[PDB]
Structures are given as C-alpha cells and as structure tokens.
Design a protein around this ligand. Structure first.
Ligand SMILES: *[C@@H]1O[C@H](CO)[C@@H](O)[C@H](O)[C@H]1NC(C)=O
Ligand SMILES: *[C@@H]1O[C@H](CO)[C@@H](O)[C@H](O)[C@H]1NC(C)=O
Ligand SMILES: *[C@@H]1O[C@H](CO)[C@@H](O)[C@H](O)[C@H]1NC(C)=O
Ligand SMILES: *[C@@H]1O[C@H](CO)[C@@H](O)[C@H](O)[C@H]1NC(C)=O
Ligand SMILES: *[C@@H]1O[C@H](CO)[C@@H](O)[C@H](O)[C@H]1NC(C)=O
Ligand SMILES: *[C@@H]1O[C@H](CO)[C@@H](O)[C@H](O)[C@H]1NC(C)=O
Ligand SMILES: [Cl-]
Ligand SMILES: [Cl-]
Ligand SMILES: [Cl-]
Ligand SMILES: [Cl-]
Ligand SMILES: [Cl-]
Ligand SMILES: [Zn+2]
Length: 587
C-alpha cells in the first residue's frame, strides 16, 4: 500500500461523498434562486454550510498524503485542489481580522451613498448617460472620497495580511499567489511559471499598443467635439468622461463616438416578435446551433428542469442569466428570458457554458472545470459572436435573404466592440499591474495613489480630474478590488476568446474578415472545440489551448485580426492627427 495508492482510494471515497453533497447543495441553491422565500434561504444556507464543513474536513484529510510521493499527475492535481491551505496559515486572530476587513470593505462598498444616491442605479446612470462635465466629475470625486477614503486604511491592512498569508504558503506575495492560477508543473513541453504570466501579458500588450493608441486618438477627438474646452489633443483623457464610473469599458461612449450615426445597428428583436417567438424557440435554436457542429442535444432533464422565463408575480426569482451544473448528469439554465436579441445571444452564451459542462462531466469531480479561470467565459462569448453575424441571422431566418451588408454599419459595430474589448484591456492590465506591484512591495504607501495615476497616465492614457493624495483609495473604488478578486482574468479571457474564434473559423474554412464568421454546420470546428472542452481541468491549460489553436501560448494576434478593418479605418481617420499622449498634461 503506497502513498499514491492510499491517495487514490481516498479520492474515490471523496468523489462519491462529494458528488452527493454538492448535488444537495446545488439543488437547495436552485430552489432558492427560482423561488425566493425564507424557507428556501434557510435550506440553501444549511446545505451550503454542510458542504463547506465537508470540504474543510476533507482538505484536512487530504493534507495527510504528501504530494512529493505522488508520481501520477492526475492524482496530484486532485489532491492539490483539496490541499489548498489559504488563509488557514494565519493565526486565529489574524484570520479573524482579515475576514473582518474583507467583510467591512464589501459592506461599505455595497452600502456606500453620496449625498443621497447609491452607486446602483443613481451614480451609474450619471456616469453612463450624463453629458454634464460638472455632474460626472462630482459623482466620480464623491465616490473616490466617500468610499475610497474609508477603504484606504482597511486596504493597507488587507495588503499586509494577504502578503503574510501568501509568504506563509511559500509564495513571493499575494500577487504571486494569484499568478499561481496559471501555473503548470511536471508536464514537459507544457509547464508554465508564475513569472511567465507577467512576461506574456506585457508582450501581448506591447503588440496591442498601436491599435489602442489609435482608438485613443479617435475617441479623444470625438470627446473633444463633445467636450470643447476640457480635453487636450496631446494629453490623456479625463477619468470621469469614460462612460462608466472607472473607464473600465468605453461602451457608453458610443453615443459620442459612433462613426456613422445615421446607420442603424442590426436589431432583429422586431423580427423575433413578428414571427411570434418565445423563450422555448430561442433555446431550441441555440440547441440547434450547437448540434450543427456535432455537439449533443440538451438533456431531457434540461428541458424538464430549467427556468427559461420569469415566473411572474407568483414568485420572485434571481433573474441574472446563469448556467447550472448540479452534477449527477443534471444541467440547467436559469434565465428570465424576454423575446429580445440580447436574450437570444445570452441564451447562446449560457448554453455554450452548458456544453462545456457536459463535455467534461466524465472527469473526476475535482477536474470538472475550465482549463483555467478564463476558458469558460471565452467559450461562452464565441457562441454569441457566431450567433450575431449577419450570415447566421439570414441562415436561421431573422434577416431577409437579400439584406445587404454595409461597411458603415459594420464599422459602427466594430467600434462598439473596440470600446468594450480593446478599451478594457489596458485598464485591466494597468489595474492588475498596480496590484501586483503593491503586493510585491515596489510601491510604498506614500506613492500608492501617485503610482496609480502615473500608470493611468502612461499605460492607459487617463488622468484624474482632481489631484488625489494618499488619503484616497481609488483602485478600491471598484468592486473587484474592494471584494478581493483577481482581475487579469479579463485580459487572458478576452485574448483566449478570439484565439478560439480564429482557430474555429479557420477549421470551418471561413473566408474573409474574422468578424463576419459563423461556425454553424462545421463538425471540423466542433471537433476542434470539443477536444478541449472534454479535458476540463485535467490537462495543463497550455495543452487545452493547443488542442483548439495549435499553439501552447496566449496570443493577441487573433484579436488584432478581428479588429484589423477598424484598425486600418482608424489609421486613416487619424493620419492628420496626433496619436499617443503626453503624461504631463492635467485638466
Ligand atoms: C416555493 O417555496 C415555498 C416554501 O418553501 C413552497 O411552499 C412553494 O411550493 C415553492 N414553489 C414552487 C413553485 O415550488
Ligand atoms: C493515474 O491514475 C489514474 C487513476 O487514479 C489512472 O486512471 C491513470 O491511468 C494514471 N496515470 C498514469 C500515467 O498511470
Ligand atoms: C498545507 O499545510 C501543510 C502543513 O500544515 C503543508 O505540509 C502542506 O504542504 C500545505 N498545503 C500545500 C498545498 O502546500
Ligand atoms: C436532437 O433533438 C431533436 C429534437 O429536438 C431530434 O430531432 C434530433 O434527432 C436530436 N439529435 C441528436 C443528435 O441528439
Ligand atoms: C446549415 O445547414 C442547415 C440545414 O440542416 C441550413 O438550414 C442552414 O442554413 C445552414 N447554415 C449555414 C450557415 O450553412
Ligand atoms: C465597402 O467596402 C468595399 C471593399 O473595401 C469597397 O469597395 C466599397 O467602396 C465600400 N463602400 C462603402 C459605401 O463604404
Ligand atoms: Cl455568466
Ligand atoms: Cl459537478
Ligand atoms: Cl470583454
Ligand atoms: Cl480610478
Ligand atoms: Cl471573464
Ligand atoms: Zn457567462
């Protein structure tokens, strides 16, 4: 009886106990989310507590099998997923304090109000739709001070305690700890070090820099037309004018940046209601789409047990669209579907999640997940990509067969896509680099805010409207920061998404620009995609990516391919205009 054999037996017992307990908890959670009542909340909480206690004791047991005596990499992966210590390395008092800090930061972020209006919906409405410089500036500064000033000391203590936990687990810092979510060891030709992630993010960002610079110059010009005196044509962009509370996405800038405002966007909602479509039809069409590439039908249970429309005033439900994998062959979608194009695309996205879940359902319990934190949402996004293309809507009868394309409408659509995708990439990289640097200890508190805005100036070309000192905590003014979430996932997922789409459209023998591509009816693309989906978390994410795209590494080139018509059109628009920005300017 070797250690590896004992560990195999332990994992056997664990899987059988865990699948049952996880199913009971997931079903309690489903009963709540589709039927909000006190009885259902208590059942959900009790089942979740039972599951957490089970995982606690099972991790304690798992730690009694030393990994260095495990040669089988699958057994090692599962044991490792169980043996994570985390905050438990801290003393009882230090963990108590850290959890109090985390709870406090979350509560003040969620209950914060400026006098009084609360972030959702008031200030969000202002930052999305207001065209008054003073109103927007006020809301921006108000949140930064009213909330950030509170969060600052809490965040300093949070940094100290999180770095203590990370070094107690043998990481260099909390940032190194998070970079662990991309690490791979023991598999020659597929290993990936925690440092490699930074190097590769910075490499792909070096390649994204020209497209972002030209989008920046375009948006700066258009915003100047919208804000006469307030913007310099060689300087950075005021943070309170970027379409949301942080400039995370530039989506709401469309009104001010649409290249051809007289050319409407394609919106088949009217066609969906005129053909008398219902949620059943929408989900059946998504299912047909997936069947078209050789993936299986949704289970009978899926149709029997899902919630695909709002149950109305009879009972309240959590209407956020979500895909559920309860285990034991039970797959569902929760969605308060309305007959609208957005809901058609979101249905495709979530059923893409379900297809992923079904694909890796034969893997051990602990290996049932995306290859890494970015894989699932990329799989979801590429479905909506294929569903929205005019080729596909014609194919499924939502556009008239003679519906003529138009470069102006296509460039409009591509602009919007840029404002979101390309816009958020430098934001995300800059935010996570600031956090990495704070955790690594390269930014003393005295320069915290300074470095932040310096980086905002250099990397993303955005400047603060008001001078900010070290009493604020502007990064903590965003949910992910104040609620202790990694952020680089958005960069990596966005790049993986277009890598996937390019590889699959190639397999589908698509000709022409990448954004016009529909993978429908391609069993080649379906097979390429399934060869990855079925692995779940069992193989290195480098290999999972190779199975789809033929290369083992993250690459931004497909995103540039997707945007190349817009990149060229922008370069044409900006040829007689300054591109780039000076970090010296300030409003
Ligand atoms: C919702 O929950 C309540 C309380 O548990 C229960 O009485 C009711 O039957 C549930 N509704 C449905 C549709 O199951
Ligand atoms: C690792 O162990 C699993 C059973 O736990 C087995 O299915 C698999 O073949 C083993 N891998 C190798 C390389 O022996
Ligand atoms: C969890 O803690 C034990 C010591 O208490 C340690 O030997 C083990 O390696 C830790 N887990 C991991 C994944 O390092
Ligand atoms: C998928 O389901 C449809 C009915 O919705 C059925 O006609 C078809 O044969 C099924 N195909 C597969 C491959 O499951
Ligand atoms: C795929 O084939 C079906 C016939 O089964 C057809 O109705 C549909 O228009 C085709 N779509 C594409 C994009 O070729
Ligand atoms: C649309 O694009 C084609 C190909 O680049 C070009 O020949 C045509 O002149 C363009 N038309 C408009 C209206 O932009
Ligand atoms: Cl989601
Ligand atoms: Cl599961
Ligand atoms: Cl995105
Ligand atoms: Cl900010
Ligand atoms: Cl994501
Ligand atoms: Zn999703």
């Amino acid at each position: 009886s070797t250690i590896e054999e004992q560990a195999k037996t332990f994992l056997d017992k664990f899987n059988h106990e865990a699948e049952d307990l996880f199913y009971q908890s997931s079903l309690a959670s489903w009963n709540y989310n589709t039927n909000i009542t006190e009885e259902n909340v208590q059942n959900m909480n009790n089942a979740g507590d039972k599951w957490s206690a089970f995982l606690k004791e099972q991790s304690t047991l798992a730690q009694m099998y030393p990994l260095q005596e495990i040669q089988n990499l699958t057994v090692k992966l599962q044991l490792q997923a169980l043996q994570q210590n985390g905050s438990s390395v801290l003393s009882e008092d230090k963990s108590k304090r850290l959890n109090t800090i985390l709870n406090t930061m979350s509560t003040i972020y969620s209950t914060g109000k400026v006098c009084c209006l609360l972030l959702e919906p008031g200030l969000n409405e202002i930052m999305a739709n207001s065209l008054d410089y003073n109103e927007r500036l006020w809301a921006w500064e108000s949140w930064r001070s009213e909330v950030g000033k509170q969060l600052r000391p809490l965040y300093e203590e949070y940094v100290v305690l999180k770095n203590e936990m990370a070094r107690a687990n043998h990481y260099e810092d909390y940032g190194d700890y998070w970079r662990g979510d991309y690490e791979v060891n023991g598999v020659d030709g597929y290993d990936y070090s925690r440092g490699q992630l930074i190097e590769d993010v910075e490499h792909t960002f070096e390649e994204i820099k020209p497209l972002y610079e030209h989008l920046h110059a375009y948006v700066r010009a258009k915003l100047m037309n919208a804000y006469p005196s307030y913007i310099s044509p060689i300087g950075c962009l005021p943070a309170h004018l970027l379409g949301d509370m942080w400039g995370r996405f530039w989506t709401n800038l469309y009104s001010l940046t649409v290249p051809f405002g007289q050319k409407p966007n394609i919106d088949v909602t009217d066609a969906m209601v005129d053909q008398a479509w219902d949620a059943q039809r929408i989900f059946k069409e998504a299912e047909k789409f997936f069947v078209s590439v050789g993936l299986p039908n949704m289970t009978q249970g899926f149709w029997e047990n899902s919630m695909l429309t709002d149950p109305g005033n009879v009972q309240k439900a959590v209407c956020h669209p979500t895909a559920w994998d309860l285990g034991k062959g039970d797959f569902r979608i929760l969605m308060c579907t309305k007959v609208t194009m957005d809901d058609f695309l979101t249905a495709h996205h979530e059923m893409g999640h379900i297809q992923y879940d079904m694909a890796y359902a034969a893997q051990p319990f602990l290996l049932r997940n995306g290859a890494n934190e970015g894989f699932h949402e990329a799989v979801g996004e590429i479905m909506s990509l294929s569903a929205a293309t005019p080729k596909h809507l014609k194919s499924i009868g939502l556009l008239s067969p003679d519906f003529q394309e138009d470069n102006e409408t296509e460039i409009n659509f591509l602009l919007k896509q840029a404002l979101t995708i390309v816009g958020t990439l430098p934001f995300t990289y800059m935010l996570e680099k600031w956090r990495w640097m704070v955790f690594k200890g390269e930014i003393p508190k005295d320069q915290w805010m300074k470095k932040w805005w310096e980086m905002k100036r250099e990397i993303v070309g955005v400047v603060e409207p008001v001078p900010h000192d070290e009493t604020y905590c502007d990064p903590a003014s965003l949910f992910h920061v104040s609620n202790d979430y990694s952020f680089i996932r958005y960069y990596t997922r966005t790049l993986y998404q277009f890598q996937f789409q390019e590889a699959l459209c190639q397999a589908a023998k698509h000709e022409g620009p990448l954004h016009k591509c529909d993978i429908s009816n391609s069993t080649e693309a379906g097979q390429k995609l399934f060869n990855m989906l079925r692995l779940g978390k069992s193989e290195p994410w480098t290999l999972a990516l190779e199975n789809v795209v033929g290369a083992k590494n993250m690459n931004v080139r497909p995103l540039l391919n997707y945007f190349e018509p817009l990149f060229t059109w922008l370069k044409d628009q900006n040829k007689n205009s300054f591109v780039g920005w000076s970090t010296d300017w300030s409003p």
